[PDB]
Amino acid sequence: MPFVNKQFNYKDPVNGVDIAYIKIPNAGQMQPVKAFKIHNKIWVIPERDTFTNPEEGDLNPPPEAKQVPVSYYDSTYLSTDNEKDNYLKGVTKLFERIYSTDLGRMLLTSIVRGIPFWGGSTIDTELKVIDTNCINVIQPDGSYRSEELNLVIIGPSADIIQFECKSFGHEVLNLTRNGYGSTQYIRFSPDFTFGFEESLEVDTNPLLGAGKFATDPAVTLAHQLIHAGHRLYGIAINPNRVFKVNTNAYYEMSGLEVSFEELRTFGGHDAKFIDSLQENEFRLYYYNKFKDIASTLNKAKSIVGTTASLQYMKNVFKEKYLLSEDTSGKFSVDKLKFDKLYKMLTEIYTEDNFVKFFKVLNAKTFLNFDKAVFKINIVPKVNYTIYDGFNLRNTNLAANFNGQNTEINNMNFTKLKNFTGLFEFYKLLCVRGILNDLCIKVNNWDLFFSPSEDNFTNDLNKGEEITSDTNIEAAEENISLDLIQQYYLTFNFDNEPENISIENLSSDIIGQLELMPNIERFPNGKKYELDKYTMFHYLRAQEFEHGKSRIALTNSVNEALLNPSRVYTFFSSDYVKKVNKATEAAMFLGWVEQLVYDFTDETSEVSTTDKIADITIIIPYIGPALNIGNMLYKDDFVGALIFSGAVILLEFIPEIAIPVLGTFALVSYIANKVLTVQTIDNALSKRNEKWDEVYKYIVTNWLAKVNTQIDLIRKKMKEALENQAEATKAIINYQYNQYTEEEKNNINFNIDDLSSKLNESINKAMININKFLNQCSVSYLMNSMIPYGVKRLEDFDASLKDALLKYIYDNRGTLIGQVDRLKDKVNNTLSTDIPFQLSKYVDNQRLLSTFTEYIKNIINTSILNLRYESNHLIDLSRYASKINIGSKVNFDPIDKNQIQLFNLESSKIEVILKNAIVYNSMYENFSTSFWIRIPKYFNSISLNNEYTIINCMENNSGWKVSLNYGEIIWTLQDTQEIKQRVVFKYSQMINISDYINRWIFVTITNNRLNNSKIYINGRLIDQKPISNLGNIHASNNIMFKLDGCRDTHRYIWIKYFNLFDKELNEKEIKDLYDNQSNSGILKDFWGDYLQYDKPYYMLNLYDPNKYVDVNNVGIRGYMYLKGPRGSVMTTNIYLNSSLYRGAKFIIKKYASGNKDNIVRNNDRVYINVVVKNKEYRLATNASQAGVEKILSALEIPDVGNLSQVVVMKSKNDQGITNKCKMNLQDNNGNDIGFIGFHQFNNIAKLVASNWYNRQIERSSRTLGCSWEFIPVDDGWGERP
C-alpha cells in the first residue's frame, strides 16, 4: 500500500510517461528539466531551482544577509547525478513516511483530489483549464504532451534551507485565495535539517539528551504539504495578513515576520494566536468563494480542450469541494459540509498534529527558533526509516528521542556553518557608568516577542438583537486524536481523479509567479541607554571564551562583564570559594564529588509556600540568575513573588483591553406567547455564549502576550544552567591539567562522565523550573486577566436582567399566568456566574495529564523492564535487550511472570544488555526492583553459605544480589576492588514471619554521591555510604541463577524485575510497590493468587496464634478460633508456629463468569469446610437473635435456604498486603455481614456480623474480619 509504486533511479532513461524532460510555465524561455511522476498529479524535479523564477537564478549568497536566524549556501549542492539520485530517493522516502500515518494518508489523498479548478473560461457557459496549472511532457519522439498536475517538489534556491510553496498567477484572479487553486511548486531538500533546543520534555523524559536536536525532515515536508493543501483549495490566508509586533523597546525584537497563514499551519498554540472574530471572517470568506465556484459550475453548459465529459469534470469538482447536488444537477454548498472540510484542511492538517503522529521531538512553537543547520542522509535504512524516522526501534536511539540528539547520534548529523553571522542582527544594550559604558549585543532572536495590540480585534462591544428565531452557535470542540479518527474512518480513499487527455498547450507556457509583498528589512544595531543591569546582561555575564587560562566564578555581575576570566554565578558564595580554590592532586576526586553534589544541591532547591493559591513551589535562584525584579537576596525574590504575584516575572505588563459588552435588544411579539418565551430563552442562551467568548478572548491574549514571556524566561534559565555547568567543568578541567603526568595517572578522570552527571542535574532542575513557571503563567491568567473579563460579564448580566424583566412586564398581557415563573428563570439564571475552566480552552491543563506525565517519567527511566508477554519472557523497555532462557527455568502456569529458578546450571536467565545501557561510571545513579519468594531454610548446610542470584559483575566490578541464611544482600564494587554491601536480615525464629517463604518486594537505589539504600515492601531498611567508590564498570549481561548455593534442593521465585536509570525516591518506591501488588486479585498467605478448589488452612489477622476448628458438624454445632498453634522446628535453623493446624476452607465457584480458577475481587462464592477429610458448606441462619450470626459447617445437601453466598474482597496490608475479607449474603441480596469472630462464654465463634460493614476500612491494625488463606507449599513444608 505504498504512495510511490515505482522505485526510480535518476539515471533511468526518459519514457515519456512517468520519466521525462518537462517544461513548467515561465515568463520567458525555460530550459527543460528531468522530472519524475511519483504519484498521480505529483512530480519531483531533482534540481536546484533556478527555473521557477528566472529573476533569482544565481545560487550564490546575497549581498546582504537574509534576516532569518539560520541560512546555508552551497552552490555546488545537487549538481551531480549522484546527489540527484539521492534527492529523489530521500524525497520519496519522506512521502512514504507521511503516507504511513493516518493523518498523512488523508493529507496526501486530499492533495491529489485537490485538482486546480478550471477557471480559464471568459465565457461562463464553457469550462476551460487554466494553462499555468499544467506542464509539457517531452516524449522520446520529440513531441510534447500537455498534462495537468497538482504538486511539484523541486530543489531549493540559493538558500538551501529555505523551503516554501510557489505557484503561478492569473492576470486578475488570486488562485490561492479564491478557492480555485493553482499547481504548487515546493522548494525542498531532504539532505539538510535544523537544530533546536528543547527543555520541555524533561517532565516525561528526565534522561533527555544534552545539546541540539534535529528536526525530523518528515515534519518539515509535511509542513509545506499543508501550505500546498491550502493553496490547492484556494483557502490560503492573504500574505499581507501578518502578526505585527512591537519593536521600539530595548527588550523587544528588532522585528519579526510571521503570517496568519503560517500560524494556521503550525497549529497548536501558535494558531490560537488568531482570535475568534478573524477566524470567523476567514471561514465565511472562503465559504462564499466556494459558493461562487458552485454558481460558475451551474452555468457551465459544455467543456473545452479535453475528450473527457462535462459530467466527469463537474463530478471531479463536486468531490473536491464537497458540493451538494439536487435532483436537477444544480450545485450548492452545505454550510455543514463546508465547515467539516475547511476544518480538516486548517485544523486537522497542522504541524502540531503531525508531530503527535510521528512521535518525534519538535519545536512546540515558532518562537523556539532554529539555532543551527545540519547535513543528513536519510536514504539508508541504518540511518532513517519510514516507521521510526531517526529514532530506531529496539535500540538506544528509540529512547528519549536520542535518534534526534545530534551529539548522541552524531554520525547522522554533521554540523555545517550557519551563514547567518554572529550577532548579524542585534540590539545594543548599554548600562550607564555603574567607569564608563559597558555595552553588549543581543541576538534578535534572543529578544522578547511582544504582539501589537491591533492584532486582537473583537466585536465584544457590539450589541445584538435577540429574536424568537435567533439561534445558537455550537460548542466548537477542540481537536483530538479521536476526532481525527472520526474524519479518518469516514474519509474516502477510492476515487482519485483520472489523468485526462487535454488539448495541447503551446510549446512554452507563459506565466509568472504570484507576487510576494515587499517587506522592510528591520533596523539593525539600535542602541539603548539603561540605568540598570538587564536580564540580557546577567545572562551574558555567565559566558566565557575557551582558552588556556583559569577562569573563576564571581558573585559580581560587574566584575564578570568586565573580565574575560570572570564568570558570574548565582550559586552561593560558598560554592564560589570552593570551585575557585587551588586543589592538591590527592584531593582532586573528592573535590569534584563535592562540586557535583553542591551543584546538584543548589540547582535542585525548591521552596514551598503555603500562603498563596495557585503557586505551590518557588525556585528562588531564578531571581539572581536573571535579575528578575531587583534588589539582593533570593529571599527578596521568594518574598516579592508571594507578595506581588506572578507579575514580577514579566518583562512587560500586557494590555488586556475588555470593553463594556454590547447589550441585548429583544424584539417583541404581540399576543404571541410562544414566540415571546423563545426570545427570552434565546437571550439567556446567547448570554452563556457571551461568557465563553470573553473567556476565549482572554486566553488568546494570554497565550500571545504572557505565556510567551514565561516561555522565554524558561529557555533562558536552561541557558543559565548550562553556562554554570560549562564554567564549573572548565575550572575542574583546568585544575586537572595542572597536574604532573604521574599525578594524573593515579586519578581516573573522565570529563564526559562528569558532563553526563551535570546534565542530569540540569534536567532535574528544569523539571522544577518548568512546573514553577507553568503555575506562574496560569496564576497570572486566573488572577490578573480573567477577573477583568468577569467584571465586564457581571455588568452585562445586570443590564440583561433589567432588560429581560422589562420585557416580561411590558408583555405581561401575552405572558399572563407565566409572569412569576419567568421572573424566576431570569433572576436565577443571571444571578449565577459561569466559572472559568482553563482545561476547556487549552490542551495541556487537564488534571489527569499530570498523573499521566508521572507514569511516563517512571516508564522512561526503565532501562530494563522484564515481563512475560504472549508466549515469551521479554524486555518491554525501548532498548529491547535480548533474553536467553535456560532449559530448566520454570514458569508458574497460573501467573507466568512468576519465575522459578532451581539450583541447576540449566535453570537460568541471561539478559544481554545493549551497550548504551551497560553501566560504566563514577557518578551515575541507578536503581533495581523486583519481587522474590525465598523458601524457608531447612538445613544447616544453608548456614553461612552466601550464594548469588542476580549477577552483574565483570572482572570484580559491578553489582549483584545475593542471599544467605535469613539475608538478602546487595553488593557494589569498583574497578579497584573497593566494595560496599548492604543487607536486609530476617529471623527464622519467629511465631509468624512477614518474610519467610512469602513474596517480598525489594528495591535498591544507588546515589554515587551519597548512599546505597535497600527497601523492603516499600520501606527503607538500611543504607550505606558509597561515595568512596571509584569507577564502577558492570557486566555486559545480567545473570539470574543460583551461584554458589550448597543446598541442592534450594530454589527461588522471582518476578517483575526492573532496572532504572535514576535513584528512586520514597514516593516512587511506594507507588511502585502498590501498583505491582495487583490489588484486583485476592492473594493467599504466601502472596500467590488465591484460587478456587484449593484447600487452605485459616488464620485470623487479629489473633494469629489461633486457628479455625469445628466444634460439631451440623446446624447445632459451630466453628471457632482455637489454640495454641504449636510449633515446628529444626534446631539452630528455624523455630516457627505451625501453619497447617486447623480446619480447611475451600472456595467454590458460584457466580464465576469464566474458568481460570483465580479469585478476583468481588467474586460471589461458596465456602466449603474440610473436617476429618470430608466437605461441608459454610452457612448460617441469619434469623437467630443478635447481630452476630454464628457460623456452622453443614451437610452440603442440607443447606436449604440458609445464608451461604460469600462476596470475596481484597484489601491492602502493610508489610504483608495479604488482607482478605468475606462478606456473607442471604439469597435476597441482603448483607449478613463480614466473617469474623465473637466471644460467647470463653469460646471464640466464627460470626457474620454487620457491625463490620459499619466500620471504615483500616481501623487500627487489628480487625477480626481480616483473614489469611494458607495452602500447603513446598517452601514451608511441615507435616500435615
Q: Which of residues 544-563 bind Ca ion (CB under 5 A)?
A: 560
Total residues found in the chain within this entry: 1280
In whole angstroms, give the CA distance from residue 1047 to residue 580: 58
Residues in contact with other proteins, counted by CB under 8 A, come to a total of 85
What is the nearest approach in angstroms of other proteins to the Cβ of residue 803?
20
Instruction: Decide: 936 and 988 in contact? Cβ < 8 Å.
Output: yes
Instruction: In angstroms, give the least distance from the CB of 596 to Ca ion.
Output: 24
**Taking CB within 5 to 8 Å according to partner kind, which of Ca ion, other proteins, Zn ion, none is near residue 414?**
none
Residue matched to cell numbers 541576538: 443
Q: Which does 1228 bind (CB under 5 to 8 A by kind): Ca ion, Zn ion, other proteins, none?
A: other proteins
Site for other proteins contains 327 (CB under 8 A): no
Dist CA 631 CA 727 (whole Å)? 25
By C-alpha distance, which of 1042, 1098, 1109 is closest to 1244? 1109
Nearest distance from residue 534's CB to Ca ion, in Å? 16
The backbone torsions φ and ψ at residue 575, rounded to the nearest 5 degrees and listed phi first, read: -60, -40
The reply on whether position 1016 binds other proteins by CB under 8 A is yes
Residue 370 interacting with Zn ion (CB under 5 A): no
Asked whether 299 and 330 are in contact (CB, 8 A), the reply is: no
Q: How far is the CB of 549 from Ca ion (least distance, A)?
A: 11
Q: Binding partner of residue 379 among Zn ion, Ca ion, other proteins, none, CB under 5 to 8 Å per kind?
A: none
Choosing from 415, 906, 1151, 1198, the residue that interacts with other proteins (CB under 8 A) is 1151
The CA distance from 1109 to 1116, in Å, is 15
Q: 295 or 565: whose CB is closer to Ca ion?
A: 565
Sign of CA dihedral 383, 387, 388, 392: negative
Contact flag: residue 1254 with other proteins (CB under 8 A): yes
What is the DSSP secondary-structure string of 661-682? Answer: PPPEEEPP-TT-HHHHHHHHHH
Q: Of Zn ion, Ca ion, other proteins, none, which one does residue 481 interact with (CB within 5 to 8 Å by kind)?
A: other proteins
For position 351 contacting Zn ion by CB under 5 A, the verdict is: no
Q: Cβ 1250 to other proteins, closest distance in Å?
A: 6
Site residues (CB under 8 A) for other proteins, limited to 462-481: 481
Does residue 335 sit in helix, strand or coil? helix
Q: Which three cell numbers stand for residue 887?
A: 532449559
Sign (positive/negative) of CA torsion 556, 560, 565, 571? Answer: positive
Least distance in Å: CB of 211 to Ca ion? 22
Residue 848 binds to other proteins (criterion: CB under 8 A) = yes
Nearest CB to other proteins, comparing residues 750 and 831: 831
Please count the other Cβ atoms lying within 10 Å of the Cβ belonging to residue 187: 20
Q: Taking contact as CB under 8 A, which single stretch among the options 217-225, 768-776, 847-855, 1265-1273 is the one that binds other proteins?
A: 847-855
Residues 530-559 that bind other proteins (CB under 8 A): none
- Comparing CA positions, the residue from 1012, 404, 368 lying closest to residue 708 is 368
To Ca ion, the closest distance from the beta carbon of 535 in angstroms equals: 17
Q: What is the dihedral of CA 52, 56, 57, 63, to 10 degrees?
A: -150
Beta-sheet strands, E only, within 40-170: 42-48, 126-127, 134-138, 144-148, 151-155, 164-166
CA distance 456 to 276: 9
Whole-angstrom distance between the N-terminal and C-terminal Cα of the chain? 66
Judged by CB, which is closer to Zn ion: 265, or 1218?
Answer: 265
Select from 131, 191, 216, 262 the one that contacts Zn ion (CB under 5 A): 262
Which of 141, 326, 477, 482 lies at the binding interface for other proteins (CB under 8 A)? 482
Mode of pairing for the β-strands spanning 1206-1210 and 1164-1170: antiparallel
Write the single-letter amino acid at 310. Answer: L
Q: Which stretch binds other proteins (CB under 8 A): 29-37, 162-170, 579-587, 604-612?
A: 604-612
Grid cell digits, residue 835: 466559572
As a whole number of angstroms, the distance between CA 726 and CA 762 comes to 12
Site track for Ca ion across 391-420, x = CB under 5 A: ------------------------------
Residue 55 corresponds to which amino acid?
Answer: E
Shortest Cβ distance from residue 1164 to other proteins (Å)? 8
Q: Does 985 bind other proteins (CB under 8 A)?
A: yes
Is residue 1033 a known part of a binding site? Answer: no
If binding is defined by CB under 8 A, does position 1120 make contact with other proteins? no
Sequence-separated (6 or more) residues with CB below 8 Å from residue 12: 19
Q: Which of 1058, 1085, 1061, 933 is nearest to 999 (CA)?
A: 933
Site for other proteins in 1218-1247 (CB under 8 A): 1226, 1228-1232
Q: Minimum distance from CB of 267 to Zn ion (Å)? A: 11
Judged by CB under 8 A, which stretch of 205-213, 1097-1105, 1236-1244, 1253-1261 contacts other proteins?
1253-1261
829 binds other proteins (CB under 8 A): yes
What binding mask, one character per residue, do residues 923-952 give for other proteins by CB under 8 A, x or -?
-----------------x--xx-x------
96 lies in the site for Zn ion, by CB under 5 A: no
Q: Which is nearer to other proteins, 60 or 1131 (CB)?
A: 1131
| Least distance CB 1260 / other proteins (angstroms) | 6
Toward Ca ion, which CB reaches closer, 560 or 1029? Answer: 560
Alpha-carbon span 30 to 22, nearest angstrom: 10
Q: How far apart are the C-alpha atoms of 130 and 171, rounded to whole Å?
A: 11
Query: In the window 638-657, what residues touch Zn ion (CB under 5 A)?
Result: none
Quote the cell numbers at residue 799: 443590564
Task: Tell me: does residue 1226 bind Zn ion (CB under 5 A).
Answer: no
Q: Residue written as cell 491568567?
A: 781
- Quote the distance between the C-alpha of residue 564 and its chain's center: 41
Number of residues that bind Ca ion (CB under 5 A): 2
Q: How far apart are CA 732 and CA 575, in angstroms?
A: 13
| Interaction residues for other proteins, span 868-927 (CB under 8 A) | 870
Q: Is 387:360 a contact under the CB 8 Å cutoff?
A: no
CB nearer to other proteins: give 416 or 834: 834
The answer to whether the annotation marks 223 as part of a ligand binding site is: yes
What would the grid cell of residue 172 be?
A: 486578475
What is the rounded CA–CA span in Å between residue 462 and residue 470? Answer: 16
Closest CA to 514 of 128, 185, 129, 22: 185
Query: What are the φ and ψ backbone dihedral angles of 954, each rounded to 5 degrees?
Result: -135, 120
Q: Which amino acid is at 1103?
A: D
861 residue type, one letter: T
Stretch in the footprint of Zn ion (CB under 5 A) among 264-272, 327-335, 422-430, 634-642:
264-272
Residues 624-653 close enough to bind other proteins by CB under 8 A: none
- Among 517, 817, 893, 1080, interactor with other proteins by CB under 8 A: 1080
Q: Of 78 and 438, which has the nearer Cβ to Ca ion?
A: 438
| Residue 262 marked as a ligand binder | yes
Contact region for other proteins (CB under 8 A) — 211-219, 486-494, 520-528, 1192-1200? 486-494
Q: Of 164 and 465, which has the nearer Cβ to Zn ion?
A: 164
Supply the minimum distance, in Å, between the C-beta of residue 546 and Ca ion. Answer: 13
Q: Which of residues 86-125 bind other proteins (CB under 8 A)?
A: 102
- Residues from 564 through 593 that contact Ca ion (CB under 5 A): 566
Check: CB of residue 765 under 8 Å from CB of residue 757: no
- Helix (H) / strand (E) containing 980: strand 979-985
| Among the listed residues 285, 287, 488, 522, the single contact to other proteins using CB under 8 A | 488
Q: Is 520 exposed, middle or buried (0-12, 13-18, 19+ CB in 10 A)?
A: exposed
If contact means CB under 5 to 8 A according to the sort of partner, which of other proteins, Zn ion, Ca ion, none does residue 262 touch? Answer: Zn ion
Annotated binding site: 223, 227, 262
For Zn ion, the binding residues (CB under 5 A) are 262, 265
Annotated binding site for Zn(2+): 223, 227, 262
